[PDB]
Every structure is written in C-alpha cells, then in structure tokens.
Amino acid sequence: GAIHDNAMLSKFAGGLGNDWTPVRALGSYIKGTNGKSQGVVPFLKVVNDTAVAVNAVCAYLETWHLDIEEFLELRKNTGDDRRRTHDMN
Amino acid sequence: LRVIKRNGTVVPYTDDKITVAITKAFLAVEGGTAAASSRIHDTVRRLTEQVTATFKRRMPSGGTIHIEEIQDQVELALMRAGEQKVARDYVIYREARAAERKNAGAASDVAQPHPSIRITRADGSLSPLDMGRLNTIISEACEGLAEVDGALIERETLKNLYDGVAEKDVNTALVMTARTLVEREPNYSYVTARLLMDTLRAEALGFLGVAESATHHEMAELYAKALPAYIEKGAEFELVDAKLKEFDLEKLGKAIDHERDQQFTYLGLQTLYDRYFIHKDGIRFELPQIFFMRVAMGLAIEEKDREARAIEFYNLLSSFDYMSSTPTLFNAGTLRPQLSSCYLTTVPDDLSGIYGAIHDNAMLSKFAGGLGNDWTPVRALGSYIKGTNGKSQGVVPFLKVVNDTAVAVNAVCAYLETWHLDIEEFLELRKNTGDDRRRTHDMNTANWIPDLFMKRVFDDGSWTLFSPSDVPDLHDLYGKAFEERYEYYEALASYGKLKLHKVVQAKDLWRKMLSMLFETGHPWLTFKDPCNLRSPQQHVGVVHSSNLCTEITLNTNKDEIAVCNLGSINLVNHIVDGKLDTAKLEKTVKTAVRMLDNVIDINYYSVPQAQNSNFKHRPVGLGIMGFQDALYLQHIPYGSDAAIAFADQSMEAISYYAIQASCDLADERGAYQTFQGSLWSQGILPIDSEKKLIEERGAKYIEVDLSETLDWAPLRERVQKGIRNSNIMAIAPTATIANITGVSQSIEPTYQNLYVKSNLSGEFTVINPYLVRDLKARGLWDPVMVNDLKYYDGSVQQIERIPQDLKDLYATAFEVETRWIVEAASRRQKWIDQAQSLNLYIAGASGKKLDVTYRMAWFRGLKTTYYLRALAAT
Numbered sequence A: 001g002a003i004h005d006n007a008m009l010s011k012f013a014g015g016l017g018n019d020w021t022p023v024r025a026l027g028s029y030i031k032g033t034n035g036k037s038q039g040v041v042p043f044l045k046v047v048n049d050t051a052v053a054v055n056a057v058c059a060y061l062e063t064w065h066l067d068i069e070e071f072l073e074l075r076k077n078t079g080d081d082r083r084r085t086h087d088m089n
Numbered sequence B: 001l002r003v004i005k006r007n008g009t010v011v012p013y014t015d016d017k018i019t020v021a022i023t024k025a026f027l028a029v030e031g032g033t034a035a036a037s038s039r040i041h042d043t044v045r046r047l048t049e050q051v052t053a054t055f056k057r058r059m060p061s062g063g064t065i066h067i068e069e070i071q072d073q074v075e076l077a078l079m080r081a082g083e084q085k086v087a088r089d090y091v092i093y094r095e096a097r098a099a100e101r102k103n104a105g106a107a108s109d110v111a112q113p114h115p116s117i118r119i120t121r122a123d124g125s126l127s128p129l130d131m132g133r134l135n136t137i138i139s140e141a142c143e144g145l146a147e148v149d150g151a152l153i154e155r156e157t158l159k160n161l162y163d164g165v166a167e168k169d170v171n172t173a174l175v176m177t178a179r180t181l182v183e184r185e186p187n188y189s190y191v192t193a194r195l196l197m198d199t200l201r202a203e204a205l206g207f208l209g210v211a212e213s214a215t216h217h218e219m220a221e222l223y224a225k226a227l228p229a230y231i232e233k234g235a236e237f238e239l240v241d242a243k244l245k246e247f248d249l250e251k252l253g254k255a256i257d258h259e260r261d262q263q264f265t266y267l268g269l270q271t272l273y274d275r276y277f278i279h280k281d282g283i284r285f286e287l288p289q290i291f292f293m294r295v296a297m298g299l300a301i302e303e304k305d306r307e308a309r310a311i312e313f314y315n316l317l318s319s320f321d322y323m324s325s326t327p328t329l330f331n332a333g334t335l336r337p338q339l340s341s342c343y344l345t346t347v348p349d350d351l352s353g354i355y356g357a358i359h360d361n362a363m364l365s366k367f368a369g370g371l372g373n374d375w376t377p378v379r380a381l382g383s384y385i386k387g388t389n390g391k392s393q394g395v396v397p398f399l400k401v402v403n404d405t406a407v408a409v410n411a412v413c414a415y416l417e418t419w420h421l422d423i424e425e426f427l428e429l430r431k432n433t434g435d436d437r438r439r440t441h442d443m444n445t446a447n448w449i450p451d452l453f454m455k456r457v458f459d460d461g462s463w464t465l466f467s468p469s470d471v472p473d474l475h476d477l478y479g480k481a482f483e484e485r486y487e488y489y490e491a492l493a494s495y496g497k498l499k500l501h502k503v504v505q506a507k508d509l510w511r512k513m514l515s516m517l518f519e520t521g522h523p524w525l526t527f528k529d530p531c532n533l534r535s536p537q538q539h540v541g542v543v544h545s546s547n548l549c550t551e552i553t554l555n556t557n558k559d560e561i562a563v564c565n566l567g568s569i570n571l572v573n574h575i576v577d578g579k580l581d582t583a584k585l586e587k588t589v590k591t592a593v594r595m596l597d598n599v600i601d602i603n604y605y606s607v608p609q610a611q612n613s614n615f616k617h618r619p620v621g622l623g624i625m626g627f628q629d630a631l632y633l634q635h636i637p638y639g640s641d642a643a644i645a646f647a648d649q650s651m652e653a654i655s656y657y658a659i660q661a662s663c664d665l666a667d668e669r670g671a672y673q674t675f676q677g678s679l680w681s682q683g684i685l686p687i688d689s690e691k692k693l694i695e696e697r698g699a700k701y702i703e704v705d706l707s708e709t710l711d712w713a714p715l716r717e718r719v720q721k722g723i724r725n726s727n728i729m730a731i732a733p734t735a736t737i738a739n740i741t742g743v744s745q746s747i748e749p750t751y752q753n754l755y756v757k758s759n760l761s762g763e764f765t766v767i768n769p770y771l772v773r774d775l776k777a778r779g780l781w782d783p784v785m786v787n788d789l790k791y792y793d794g795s796v797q798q799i800e801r802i803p804q805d806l807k808d809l810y811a812t813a814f815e816v817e818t819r820w821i822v823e824a825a826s827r828r829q830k831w832i833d834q835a836q837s838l839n840l841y842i843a844g845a846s847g848k849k850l851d852v853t854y855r856m857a858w859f860r861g862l863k864t865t866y867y868l869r870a871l872a873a874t
C-alpha cells in the first residue's frame, strides 16, 4: 500500500519522504511462513524501481535498525547491485 | 632390501629365489629337455631383472616388501612378455598352494567372536542389543517383496557396529546398507523405507506418549490410539485446526490401514517426512497414515457425513490412487488453510490498477503462490499519457517492479500478446547479457499468440504492432471477431489514420520468438484463440492468459483472480493385467472431483476477488500422473501409434467420468452460479469444442483427430441440466506428488533411466525399476549390464545385448521424436476443458527444427507449450 501511494503521489513529479524504520530487519521471524525476513532493502529495491518507472524519493531509517549497515551503502558505485538503490535517496 | 615372509620372519632379498621360481614354471609347461637352454636362462634373468628393478625404482636405500607383492610382480613380468602358457600355469600353481594354506588355516582355526554390542539409551544407560526385535523389523520389511534377502541385510549391517552404539544410529546403519542394494534390486527401496519407518514410529509415538517404541504390525492397534493423541497435541500447539476435534476419532482410528505404510518408496517417505509431516521442536509427531487422515479430515470439515467422507478421502489418498496438490497436502486440516496456491490475474491500463496488481502479486505470493499475469492491456512505448502530457515507456519498467517483488516475497509469469508494441523488448527479457534495465532475470515470460499471427507465419504475411491504448478492444476479442477487428485496425494504420504502429514480417518475429526460446528458455508459446474458443465460460468472461505452468485457462477481470484447485490421478494404480481398469477409474475420479470441489469451500482467501471467482464459477483441475509408467506396464513405447492411442482413450475415459462426477455434485449441491449460458448448458463438450475450433480457424491451418470410443450423447444431455464446476480437467506438473506416490511425472517421458543421487555419504545410483524388471525376464540383468548403463547414463540405445523392442520401450526423453509428444498431447487436449503443461525435448537443436515443431503444436490444436529442453550436440 505504501508503494502504491508512492506511485500515485509521484504521478505528477511529486517528491516523497518514506519512513521505513518500522519494517522488520534481516533475521526477524515471520509468522506468515516459518522463515526469516531479508530486511528492508529488498522492498527498497521495489521503491527504487517504482521511482524509475513513474519518473524523487528519500528513504529514512533509524540508527538502531539492524539493517542500517546495508542501508549506509545503498549508493556505492560498485558492488552487488541487489544491495544498491541508485535511483533512491 | 628384505622381504616379509608369509609368517613374520624377515630375510635378505635374493634374486635366486625369483630366478628359481620362474624357472620352475618354465620347466613345468615344457619338458626336462629345457633344463639346459640359453633361451630359458636368458629369459628368466631378464624377467628377474625388471622385477628387482621395479622394487628399486619406487624405494630409496633398502626397504621391506611382502612375499605376495613379489609373486604379483613376477606374474606381471611373465604376462607383459606374452608368456601366456607359463604365466597361467604360474597363476594356477600359485593359487593351488594358496588354497592349501587357506584350508590348513581354517583347520587350525579357533572361534572367539562374542558377546554382543551394548546399545546406548538416550538417558545414557547401556543395554544389550535385542537380536529378536532386529529380526522382526527386517522380516516385516522384506515382507511381500521378491529377490530381497533379509538375512543378507542383517549380516551386512551387523558388521559396522561398535560397543556403545546408540539405537539412533543403529537404524540409520540398517538404512545405509539397505539403499546400497537398490542398484541391483529396486524392491530394496521399499525395504529401505520400511526400515526408516521404525525411527518415525519411535519419534512420533514417544512424543505422543503412546509408546516408546513399536514395530510395523504393532501399528494395527496403535494407529487408533495415536490419532486422538495426535489431534489433541496438534490443536494444543495450534498446528492442527481445532475443528478436527469435532470428528469421531474412535471411528476414524479404526479406518486406518497400517499395511499401506508398506507402499512407500524411500524417496516418497523422505519427501513427506522432510517437508509435509507436522512437527514441533524439530520432532515429527505425525505418522504417514495419520498424515493422510488429517488431509482427508481437513477436506471434509463441512461434509454432512464427516466421517464417511473423511474415510472415503483417506482411502483414496493413502492408496495412492489420487493425490491432492502440494498446498492441499500441506495445509488441509490446519488453521486458515491455503489449499490452492495458483492464480491468474489481468492488469488494467491505469497506474492505480497497475500497482493494485503489484499489491495482489505480493499478497498471493505471501505463502509460495504461483502467478500468471496478463500485461497486454498496459499501453506500450510511445503511447500518450494525459495529465503527464508525456509518453509512456511501456510495460517493461513495470515488469521490473514485478520482478523485484518476486525476489522480495520469494514465481510469476508475465504474458504479452503478439501485436503489443513492446513485444520485441519482451522477447529479450531473459537474455544473460545486455542492458540490465531491459532484463527481468527473476520473472517468467510467455507469448499470448493469436491464431492470426500463426496464419501470417504460414502464409509469409505481414504483422502490425499496436499499443493497446489505441486498440483497447483487441485483447478481449478472439477468433473471427478478433481477425476482422485486427484487419480493420491494420488497414487504418496503412492509411495514416493510426500513427503509432510498426509493420514487421511475421516470419521474422516468429524466428526471433523461437531463437529467444532456444537461447533463454523464454518466452513460452501459448495460443490465445483455442484457450478462448474452447473455454466453457465464454458467456461471462474472457481468458486473458494462462498460468505460471501453462495448463490453466480461466477468466479474469477487475473483480476476478482465477484460482487453480488441482489434483492428479495415478494412472499406474489403474493398470491391471496390462489393461486400464475402466471400472476402478470411475470410482477414483468421482471421489477426486468431490475432494476438489470441497477445496473451494475450505480454502482460506486472502484477496476478495480470488474468493469471488472461485465461489462464482467453481473451477477445478483434475490431472494425471504415471503416464510413462503406465506405458511400461503395457509394453508400449512412447514413440508409437499405440502410445498415441492410449493417450487418446485414457483421457476420453477420465473425461467422461470427471464430467459425469460434476453432474452428480450438481444434483447434490446445485450447479455453479454462472452455469446458465456456459458451453455445458449448450451441450458443447470438449470433443465438440475441437470441432468448432476447426470450423473457426479453418482446415487449412488445423488438423486434429476426432475419433471417439464412447457414447457421449447420453452424457451430453445430462450436462445441459447442470454441472457443479465450470472447468474440470488440467494436467499440471506433479514433481512432489509423483515422488510421494512413486510414479513418473504427469505426462513426461522418462528424462533418464538412471540418475546418481549424491547428497550424504558416497553416491547411490537409481535405475528405472521397470527397465530392470524387463531385463530380468530376458535374463539380461547382471553386473555387466549395470556397468554399461552407468557408462551410457542410463540409455539402453547402442547396447547390443538389449533387443530392439526394449530399446524402443525405454527410449529416453531426448531420443523420442518430438512429434510423438505433440500428437499425444493433441489427442489428450480433445477431452480436456483447460490445457496441459507440455515440456518439449529437441535434440539436434536448429531454428528449422523449432519451426516445424511449434508449427505442428499449433496445427494440432494445442492450447499451450511449456519449457523447451534443447540440445545442440546431435
């Protein structure tokens, strides 16, 4: 729903700030299945592709969040692109 | 240099002893006249030299070697010199004197081996190994099986045990030396599973507090005691739906047949135990027959006669006559059960609905659901966008969002119609190289091909690409209506009254489609018009695509996400003395359809438009498996007119019973809401759908057999009065459930008669059980045959000793001509109201060969094709 909102609010060049701190981090239990969460970054990848497709978005993460170290490196020029969001602030 | 004598002592290394030994052997085969011969003496000293040299070559300053190590090198020197008569008499004499030593040693033997190993208990206490119970489980395991030797297994096991073994790894030791025997006799697979069951019984029963240990025939009375204990603990831990306590567990406890545990192959039991049996704290406390009873109960929680129907469903499942789909097996009988996990959607051409479809993809995939997405309605590159006052970049940037959602939620297949202006970019989405902004490496793709495109290929005609926003009515049209409207738009663009378009040669786009299918495996080829013209639900909707696996053809719209509710008949269990058991097949189909209809009501729905479509139309998909194995039992090679005939008639029989079963549910539950107007209402059965399809497309472009072996006129009458399900049949892949039941995959030809599983300790080869059984009848099952099969990776071709009738019957997937698989699928499709997942295997691999193949698939009235498996080696 939040990603749907991003697309709708960006439909006419709007800018967005997204708070992603509530989304649970790598290793968290998920009662949906019986597996572990891969963190916020796989969803930020969807945010990134949405900014590209609707083209402006800045994601915020609190400093105690367990995904913070991956978050800090999302704009490095080199490395695994699955751990990068080059079109998202 | 010194030598270790036969018994301990050490002596200097003396060439003379070697020279004397070899000389004795020459004088034995020749006379005494050879005593003084420069030849012998020259030869012996030459052989003695290269022997003594060999020991010097491998060692530094002296050493010690065994006496037998020298005898072997003496034989080697004689043999490499071509001294056949002297070498063999040297061997013979040497063996004669080894026999006397061996015998004399056995005469002076003393016997000590005793007492027994002490088995270590979990608590830490030692206990002597029970030899009586050990003989009981291995005998009950070899029960009813041929060419299995219980004593042989007990001896080979008893070897690899040590003082202080735990009863935990004493069973695994029995299993280890039981599956090592399947290579020479497949029936040991059953023995291996029955031995492993001993650990499961102790694990489950000990957890339930029923018993700390138990044997097989002891389950005759313990399965009834364990069931109520299982349900109570299952609901306590919220692993089993509490409604199951509303059943009469005493009555269900008696219905359990403990002998059906003997049916399991090692792979089938491993599959259930690893992933399907309910567990807590890593402990599996659900036994196999109770597993089948849970699924049966879960499917009957809303029947009027809970117990009677639960027993009917349990008997069908536990016998392997039919097997529910993977999600039903996993979730039936649990809270909020996801019994179906296959869906079809259509994406609207607006941004909110696009991202509503992305949202649905995520929710439907939250529990391993598979998805087909129709992306055709979304406007293509260059289309106008009001409000933005810009131009669209087409569907691919949105498919990238889909692709990353599939990665985020942990498959989906996107469909696009062949006139869509983004089609060319679509065909390349799965290339390994190139711009990554134009790739979706985690998403499947499929072509949604109108008949008219294939017509233009056959006729070397042209083909115009449009954006759907300029032609919004085409996607929903089909058949003649589509071709008229499409040619109208085509003429418009040629007169400059439809600016956004692209004209290509149909053959050129067709070639690109086949080269991408060959190079990347995608997009798959599916045919829009047969899916729609033969759909029973044409009066209330349109089929916009197929599903992830390309066997489902259900309507979708703004308020309808189609749901695939699936199960498969086990054809093997309906082959008797070489014939199809027509009578037993009806009983299994009748119960199968009922179970599938129940799935609709019990299934817990996450998105409301999936509930809406299932409740409105009640489609099910009853398939088949074990087809290749059923051919074996009739000794029919897959590449023959006799297999094509069996595929036609077996589907016609199942179809009759499945349709007849749906009429029985309609009498008891009422027809589905939208029955009025369906093809069923018009008396147009699948066999009649084929006839109208030929009329519509024209005989110039389609030819399919129309033969019939049953009388359909009486059933064509009762159907018009009402049936319970809009769709009945679909042949889906059966990876897991075929392994559970121990049969071949759906309609697949055997991929290889031999495979080498290697995932624990060593590697264990598994050989087609039907092949070995036939080779026994011929007397051709022996060690050399096994060594030849490994060398040829299971191919019985080009091994001389196997007669030609078996070379044909056990031809593998890549050595059966593709035309047999297509023609067989063509005749099955005459009776199926949906479609069938059809993998194609092509050796030789040429664009020419792909052309003739997929032209034939279309020409023969197929609705879908699936994976292409191509080899360019031949």
Ligand SMILES: Nc1ncnc2c1ncn2[C@H]1C[C@H](O)[C@@H](COP(=O)(O)OP(=O)(O)OP(=O)(O)O)O1
Pocket: B003, B005, B006, B011, B012, B013, B014, B015, B017, B018, B021, B067, B070, B071, B074
């Ligand atoms: N001194 C040695 N150095 C190397 N090889 C030897 C030596 N003595 C014997 N051999 C080898 C050569 C022959 O293959 C074999 C000799 O057989 P043989 O003369 O019967 O001796 P042996 O070890 O069997 O004792 P025995 O006199 O009872 O036969 O062993």
Ligand SMILES: Nc1ncnc2c1ncn2[C@H]1C[C@H](O)[C@@H](COP(=O)(O)OP(=O)(O)OP(=O)(O)O)O1
Pocket: B020, B021, B022, B024, B025, B028, B071, B089, B090, B091, B093, B094, B097, B098, B101
């Ligand atoms: N009559 C013969 N025919 C063929 N080979 C012979 C004959 N006599 C001797 N040899 C060969 C093979 C023997 O290894 C060796 C003779 O040594 P010999 O001691 O008699 O046998 P052996 O060492 O194998 O057994 P053992 O010593 O225990 O009786 O030379």
Ligand SMILES: Nc1ncnc2c1ncn2[C@H]1C[C@H](O)[C@@H](COP(=O)(O)OP(=O)(O)OP(=O)(O)O)O1
Pocket: A010, A011, A012, A053, A054, A055, B349, B350, B351, B352, B354, B378, B379, B384, B385, B386, B388, B392, B393
């Ligand atoms: N900002 C955008 N970026 C990318 N694609 C867009 C954007 N806005 C719209 N589109 C695409 C998505 C759809 O395929 C198509 C229609 O968009 P949509 O939001 O439905 O407008 P609309 O339906 O209200 O008006 P209309 O369809 O009459 O132009 O345009």
Ligand SMILES: [Mg+2]
Pocket: none
């Ligand atoms: Mg000797």
